[PDB]
C-alpha cells in the first residue's frame, strides 16, 4: 500500500493502509481501513472504520469492523462485531 503515517508511520512490514485515520501507531500483521489510532499496536488483525484508544488487538486473525473501543475495552455498538477478536489495553 504506502502512504499512511499514524503521526510518523511505523507499520511492521506486513501490515496494510489506504485511507484510516491512525495517530502514534506501529501496526504489526493487520490490516485496518478508517480506525482511529491514539497511541496502539496490532499483532495479527484485521480492524476497519472503529475507534479505540490503546488497545491491544493482537490475535491469530483479530477482526473487527466499526467497533468505539477505549482502552482494550470494546463499547456496546450495534454496529462492532466481537467475535475473534480481543484487546488488552497495548
Same mark, same amino acid.
Given at each position: 500500500?504506502?502512504?499512511? #503515517? ?14 484510516? =485515520?491512525? =495517530? ?10 478508517? =480506525?482511529?489510532? =491514539? ?6 488483525? #484485521?480492524? #476497519? #472504520? ?41
Amino acid at each position: 500500500d504506502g502512504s499512511c #503515517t499514524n503521526t510518523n508511520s511505523q507499520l511492521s512490514a506486513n501490515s496494510k493502509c489506504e485511507k484510516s =485515520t491512525l =495517530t502514534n501507531c506501529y501496526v504489526d500483521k493487520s490490516e485496518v481501513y478508517g =480506525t482511529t489510532c =491514539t497511541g496502539s499496536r496490532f499483532d495479527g488483525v #484485521t480492524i #476497519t #472504520t472503529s475507534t479505540s484508544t490503546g488497545s491491544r488487538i493482537s490475535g491469530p486473525g483479530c477482526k473487527i469492523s466499526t467497533c468505539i473501543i477505549t482502552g482494550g475495552v470494546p463499547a456496546p455498538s450495534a454496529a462492532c462485531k466481537i467475535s475473534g477478536c480481543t484487546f488488552s489495553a497495548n
